[PDB]
RNA sequence: AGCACCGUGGCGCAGUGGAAGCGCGAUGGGCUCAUAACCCAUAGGACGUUGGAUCGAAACCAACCGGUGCUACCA
C-alpha cells in the first residue's frame, strides 16, 4: 500500500508526451536513471530521450490520462518489489552474470534479469525516407 | 487556438514528393475543466460547509 | 564424516534450500537453475556439525549466523568449549511438479526429513500431501513438521494455521510429530529446531556385510586441472554406503555397467570393473567409508558420458559380490485412490486413480531408478504385473517401488508397488 | 462558474460506477462497484456534447419503475476528481468485483497518492506585519564582507 | 634512451615536419579518360563541387551539381558533406590547364572496391619509401624515382605490391634486386618493408577429438592420445599448443591457431591421423567433428 | 520420458506478443515463439475471419515464422493460446498499453 | 572455469599507420496563421587502463580490467 509520486503529463505537440517527474519517481523505488528509462522507451517501443531539466520526452501518443501507471506497475513488480514480503525498500546488487537483487527489510535474496530485447519489432511506418537515410 | 489554426488547413492530395497532405488528421476531442478561476474567497468558509 | 543423513521436503515457494543456507552456510548451483528463477533443480548436498551448546535452551538474543550454535570448536553462547556429538548431512529434494521423478531419485538414500509449511499460503497444498505418500513407500519413521514463515505475517494466522495442521497429523501418521516455528532467511530459532534434531535417535546399519553403493552424482574431471599432468583428475561414484566399508583400493563392480543397444531387440549390459582411488567426504579425505554420509569415491578408466550424473539409481559393490541384475521385474502393486499432485480448486476435491491397464506409459521408481517401462501383463496372478525394463536394475533388497504415471505432461504418483522377486 | 463535482444520493437511483469498454449505438459497457456485471446507456444531452471515455468513472441512475431492465449515465466525474474521490474514504478503486471476484484480477496495484502538492515551499505566512514610523536601518552590501 | 625522449619532447614541440601528405604515387600527372580514382572532398559549393584526387598529388576536380546520384536528395549536403574519401571516375579531361571532370554517378555496382585496394597498396608504397630516404639526405622525388617508379613501369599495372616480381616478393625470397640499382638505400628499404609489414592474420582451427566408445582402457589410452597432441612441435611459432579447453567427458578441444597460411592444416591433419590410427587401439575411438573450427 | 518432460515443461518456448502503434488510434500487434512444426497459415486465417483483420506468415532472419495482423488485439492473442496448448500460461510476454 | 567477440562525444556507432567524425540528442536561433516536417549555429572526447613494437597511430603485440555471447556445472 506504499505511496508512489503519480507520474503526470503534458501533451506537447498532438504526438510527443513529456513527462515531468521523471525524476522524483526514479529515487523513490531507488534505482538510477538510464536502466529504468531504457525499460520503459523499450516496452512501448518508441524513440525520445531524457537529459533537458529531467523530463523525459517520448514520441508515444495517447489521449491523456492516469492511464501511464500500467507501464510503471509491470517494471515495478518484476524489478524491485520482493516476492517474500510485499514492500519496497530494495537496493540493486551485482553478483555474478546476470545476478542482481537484494531485499533489506527482511534479507530475503532474490535475483531478477535485465532486458535486452531484439527479437521482433514490426515496421513502422513511411518508408521513402527511410531507404533516403540509407541511402 | 492550436485546434483552431489545424482547422484552417489546407489541403488533400496524396503525394507532392513522396509523402502526404491530408487536412483534417482525426481529432474527436473533446476537453477537459474549464478550471474556473477561483477567487470570490476559498478557505475559511469549508469547514462550516 | 556424516552419520545421519537428513533431507528436505516441501513444496516450493515454502523453503528448501533456505532451511539448508541458514544451517550449512552453503548454496547449491548449476547455471540453468538461475535462469528459471528459484527452481533448485537437481539435489542439494552441505554438511553441519553437531556440538552441543551447554547453557542454551532458547536464550533470547545472539548472531544470526549458526556459528555460535553448532559447526564450531568454541563456543560463545555458553560461553566455554564444546563437545561433539553428532554429524548431519544435508540432502534437499524437491518441490516443484515435474522434480517428483528426481525427488523419488532421492527419496530412498534419506534417513530423514523436514516438512516445510508457510504461512503465506493455504492449508495443505496437492504437492505437500504428495511427498508424504513418497516417503511411506520406502517407510522412515522419522519427520519432523515446520512453518517456514512466521514473522512475516502475523502472530495470530500463525496459531490458526498451527491448529489446523495439528488437528489432521496423527490422524495420518502417529508419533504426534511437532509442529514447529523457525526462520531461515533471517536465521533465528535454529536453537529450538536443533535440540529436536539432537533427540533423533542413532539408527542401524550394518557394517560387515557385503558392499553396497548407491550412487546420485558424477564429475569432478577439471576445470582448471589444465596444465602439466594434463587432465583431468579422475571421476566418482559420489553417494551413499549402506552396507560394509568402503576402504580405499578395494575392487569395485558397477553392477548396471556400460549400456550396450539391442542387437535385434534384446539388448545386453556388461559390468564395469573399477578400483577405489581415494574416499573424500566434506573437506577432509576418509581412509575407510562407514555407512552413512556421501562418500566420493574415486574411480577409473576411460571417458564419455556421467556429465552431471548418468549413473542414475546404479549400485557399487565390492569385487565377487554381485546384486542381481533383473532386466524384468514382477511388481505386486497397490494403487491409492486419489490422483495427488492435481490442483483444481482445493487438495481435498482430488480425481480419483484409474485402474493399473495393459499398453500404457510408466514410469517405475525402483528405489533410484526412473526406467522406463511398458505393461505387457496384467496375468500371471490377479494383481500382478510382469513390466519389462529397458534400463536394468540390481536388486539387493525385495525393493520398494513408487509407480508413477503421466497425468498431463508430468508423473504423478499413482500407487506403490515390491518385486516378489 | 459553479461546481464540478456532486456526490452521489444512495435513494432515488444513482450509484458510482466505471466505465469497461464501449459498444455500439449509444450504449456501453459498465461495472459496479460492488454489484455484478451491467450495460450502461447515455442521456441525450451528452450526444456528443461530452465524450465518456473507457474506464472513466462516473454516476448512474436507476430506474424507478422497474429494476434490472438498463441504467444510464446521467454525469460524469472529470479526472481531476476521481482521484479525490477515490482518496476520501469513499469508493474502490478497484471497484469490488473488477471483471470478477474470485479471479482477483489486476492485484497490486501499490497505491498512487497525489502526495504531490507541497513541494517543500510555501512555508511561513505567520511573519512580520509593517514597521512603519520607525527609523530603522537598512543598508545594502551586508554579507559583501566578512573581513 | 633518446627513443622515449624524443617522444615525449616532442609532444611539446614544434612539430618535425615529414612528407606524410603529398607525392604522387605513380610516375603519371594525371589518369586517362574513365579511370576510377580515390579523391577527397574539401568542400560543397552548391553548384557541384571542388574536391582533390590522392592517387596522383593533390591535383584538383570538380563534380557538377545534379552528377551526384539519380534519386531526388533535395539537400546535396546529407549525402556526401566534407572530409571524406571516396571513389569517382573522370568523364572529361583537359591537359591543358588541367581541368577535370569527374562522376560519383558512374560508380556502380561495387567497382570502387578495387578502388580502395589500389589507393591502399599505394599509400603503403610511399610512406615506405620516405622513411628509407630520408634517414640520409636526397629529397623524395629521386629515391622514389629510383626505387617505386621502376616497379609500375617493368612490368604493367601489377602495382608495386602484388604480383612476385614487386616488393612484397622480396618480403618471401631475395634475388630481384639485381636488375635495378641501388646503394645504402637497399639496406634501410629492405629493413622497414620488414619492421612494418606484416602478413598479419590467418586461421587457428582447434583439433576437436570425440573419443566415443569403450575398452578395457580408455583414460591411459586418452593420455598416449594427448601427449603427441602438443608438442610435438614449438619450431618458430606458429606452434602448434597450448590445448587448453575441456569441453565435455570425450570432447576435448585442442587450440591450433596459426599466424603463418594454411601451414597450420597440414599439422592438424598428420597429428589426427597418427592418434587414431595409432593409438585409439587400447580405448574409445577418434572421431572428428571436424575439427577445425572456431574459425 | 521425465528428461524431455523437464526439458520441455521448464525450458525454451517462450511466447512473444507485442502491441505497438502506426499512428493517432491506429495499432499493430504480432505474435513469436510458436514452434516451427505448426501451419502458421492456418491460425493466421482464423484470427482474421473472427474479426476484421489482416495477417501474414512473414519469415525473418533469426526470428522466423512471425505473424502480425491488424489492430490492436493482445487479450484474445493470449485467451486463444491459453486453452489451446499453445502457451504453457508460463511464457505470455505483453508489452501493450 | 576456459573460449570467442567487443570497449571511441549524453546514447548507438564509423574509422586496415600521416591519426577526432556520423546518426540520434541536449541548448539557442530560422523557416510555418500554429504543430509535425525541415535547415543552421553552439558546447560536449584521458579513442578502457598499463607496458611493448613502430620515424610516426586510436588501429598492430602482450598484461590487467570491464561488458556480452558460447561451452563448463567442480569431492
Ligand atoms: N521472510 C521469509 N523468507 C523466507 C523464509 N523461508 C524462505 N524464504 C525465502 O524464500 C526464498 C525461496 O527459497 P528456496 O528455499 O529456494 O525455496 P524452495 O522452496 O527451496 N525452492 P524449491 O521449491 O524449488 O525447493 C528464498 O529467497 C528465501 O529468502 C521464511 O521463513 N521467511
Ligand atoms: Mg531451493
Ligand atoms: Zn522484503
Known sequence: RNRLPEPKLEKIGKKKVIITNFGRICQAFNRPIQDVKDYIEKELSVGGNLDSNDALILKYEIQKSTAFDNILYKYLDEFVKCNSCHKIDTTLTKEGRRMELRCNWCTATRTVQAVGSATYSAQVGKRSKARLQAM | ?49 | ?421 | QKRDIVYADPQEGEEYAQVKKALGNLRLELQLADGSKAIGSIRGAMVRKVWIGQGDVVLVSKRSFNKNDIVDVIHRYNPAEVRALVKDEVIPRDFRSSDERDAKNAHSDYVFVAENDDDGGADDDDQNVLDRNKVVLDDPLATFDEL | ?295 | QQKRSVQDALEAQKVHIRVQQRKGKKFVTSVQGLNQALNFRRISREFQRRWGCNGTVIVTPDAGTVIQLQGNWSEEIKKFLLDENMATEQNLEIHSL
Open chain 3, 1 to 421: 564424516q556424516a552419520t545421519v543423513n537428513i533431507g528436505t521436503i516441501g513444496h516450493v515457494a515454502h523453503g528448501k534450500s533456505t532451511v539448508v543456507k541458514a544451517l550449512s552456510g552453503v548454496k547449491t548451483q548449476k547455471y540453468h537453475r538461475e535462469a528459471v528463477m528459484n527452481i533448485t533443480i537437481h539435489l542439494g548436498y552441505a554438511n553441519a556439525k553437531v556440538f552441543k551448546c551447554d547453557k542454551c535452551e532458547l536464550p533470547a538474543a545472539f548472531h544470526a549466523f549458526p556459528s555460535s550454535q553448532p559447526d564450531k570448536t568454541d563456543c560463545p553462547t555458553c560461553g566455554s568449549p564444546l563437545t561433539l556429538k553428532r554429524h548431519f548431512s544435508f540432502v534437499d529434494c524437491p518441490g516443484h511438479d515435474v522434480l517428483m521423478a528426481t525427488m523419488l531419485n532421492g527419496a530412498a538414500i534419506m534417513d530423514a526429513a523436514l516438512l516445510l509449511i508457510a504461512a503465506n499460503e493455504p492449508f495443505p497444498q496437492p504437492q505437500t500431501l504428495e511427498h508424504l505418500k513418497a516417503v511411506e513407500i520406502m517407510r522412515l519413521a522419522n519427520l519432523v513438521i515446520l512453518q517456514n514463515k512466521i514473522d512475516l505475517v502475523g502472530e495470530v494466522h500463525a496459531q490458526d494455521q498451527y491448529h489446523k495442521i495439528r488437528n489432521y497429523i496423527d490422524s495420518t501418521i502417529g508419533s504426534n510429530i511437532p509442529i514447529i516455528p523457525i526462520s531461515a532467511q533471517l536465521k533465528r530459532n535454529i536453537d529450538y529446531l536443533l535440540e529436536y534434531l539432537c533427540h533423533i535417535p542413532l539408527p542401524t546399519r550394518q557394517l560387515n556385510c557385503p558392499a553396497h553403493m548407491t550412487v546420485v552424482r558424477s564429475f569432478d574431471i577439471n576445470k582448471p586441472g589444465e596444465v602439466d599432468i594434463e587432465n583431468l583428475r579422475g571421476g566418482v561414484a559420489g553417494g551413499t554406503v549402506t552396507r560394509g566399508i568402503i576402504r580405499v583400493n578395494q575392487v569395485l563392480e558397477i553392477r548396471p555397467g556400460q549400456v550396450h543397444a539391442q542387437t535385434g531387440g534384446t539388448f545386453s549390459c556388461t559390468p564395469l570393473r573399477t578400483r577405489a582411488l581415494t574416499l573424500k567426504a566434506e573437506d577432509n579425505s576418509l581412509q575407510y567409508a562407514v555407512p552413512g554420509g556421501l562418500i566420493a569415491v574415486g574411480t577409473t578408466l576411460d571417458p564419455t558420458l556421467t556429465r552431471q550424473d548418468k549413473m542414475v539409481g546404479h549400485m557399487i559393490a565390492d569385487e565377487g559380490s554381485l546384486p542381481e541384475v533383473y532386466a524384468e521385474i514382477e511388481v505386486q502393486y497397490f494403487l491409492f485412490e486419489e490422483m495427488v499432485g492435481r490442483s483444481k480448486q482445493r487438495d481435498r476435491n482430488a480425481k480419483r486413480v484409474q485402474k493399473l491397464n495393459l499398453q500404457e506409459t510408466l514410469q517405475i521408481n525402483v528405489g533410484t531408478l526412473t526406467a522406463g517401462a511398458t505393461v505387457v501383463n496384467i496375468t500371471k496372478n490377479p494383481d500382478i504385473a510382469k513390466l519389462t525394463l529397458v534400463t536394468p536394475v540390481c536388486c539387493t533388497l525385495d525393493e520398494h517401488i513408487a509407480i508413477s504415471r503421466l497425468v498431463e505432461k508430468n508423473f504423478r504418483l499413482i500407487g506403490w508397488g515390491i518385486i516378489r522377486r
Open chain 5, 1 to 295: 634512451l633518446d627513443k622515449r625522449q624524443q617522444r615525449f619532447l616532442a609532444a611539446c614541440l614544434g612539430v618535425t615536419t615529414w612528407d606524410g601528405r603529398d607525392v604522387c604515387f605513380y610516375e603519371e600527372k594525371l589518369p586517362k579518360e574513365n579511370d576510377v580514382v580515390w579523391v577527397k572532398v574539401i568542400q560543397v559549393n552548391d553548384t557541384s563541387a571542388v574536391v582533390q584526387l590522392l592517387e596522383y598529388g593533390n591535383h584538383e576536380g570538380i563534380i557538377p551539381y545534379t552528377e551526384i546520384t539519380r534519386i531526388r536528395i533535395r539537400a546535396i549536403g546529407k549525402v556526401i558533406k566534407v572530409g571524406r574519401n571516396e571513389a569517382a571516375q573522370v568523364i572529361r579531361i583537359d591537359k591543358e590547364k588541367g581541368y577535370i571532370d569527374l562522376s560519383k554517378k558512374q560508380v556502380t555496382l561495387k567497382e570502387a572496391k578495387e578502388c580502395e585496394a589500389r589507393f591502399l597498396k599505394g599509400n603503403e608504397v610511399r610512406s615506405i619509401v620516405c622513411h628509407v630516404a630520408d634517414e640520409c639526405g636526397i629529397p623524395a622525388a629521386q629515391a622514389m624515382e629510383m626505387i617505386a617508379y621502376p616497379l609500375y613501369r617493368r612490368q604493367p599495372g601489377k602495382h608495386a605490391w602484388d604480383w612476385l616480381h614487386e616488393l612484397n616478393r622480396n618480403r618471401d625470397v631475395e634475388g630481384i634486386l639485381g636488375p635495378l640499382h641501388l646503394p645504402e638505400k637497399a639496406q634501410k628499404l629492405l629493413l622497414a618493408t620488414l619492421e612494418h609489414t606484416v602478413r598479419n592474420d590467418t586461421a587457428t582451427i582447434h583439433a576437436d577429438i570425440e573419443m566415443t566408445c569403450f575398452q578395457c582402457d580408455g583414460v591411459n589410452a586418452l593420455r598416449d592420445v594427448l601427449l603427441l597432441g602438443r608438442r610435438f612441435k614449438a619450431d618458430q611459432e606458429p606452434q602448434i599448443p597450448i590445448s587448453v579447453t575441456i569441453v565435455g567427458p570425450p570432447r576435448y578441444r585442442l587450440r591450433a591457431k596459426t599466424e603463418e597460411r594454411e601451414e597450420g592444416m597440414r599439422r592438424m591433419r598428420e597429428t589426427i591421423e597418427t592418434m587414431a590410427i595409432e593409438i585409439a587401439k587400447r580405448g574409445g575411438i577418434l572421431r572428428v567433428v571436424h575439427g577445425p573450427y572456431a574459425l
Open chain 2, 1 to 49: 487556438k492550436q485546434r483552431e489554426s489545424t482547422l484552417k488547413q489546407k489541403r488533400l492530395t496524396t503525394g507532392d514528393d513522396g509523402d502526404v497532405e491530408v487536412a483534417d488528421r482525426d481529432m474527436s476531442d473533446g476537453e477537459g475543466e474549464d478550471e474556473l478561476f477561483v477567487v470570490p474567497d476559498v478557505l475559511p468558509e469549508f469547514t462550516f460547509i
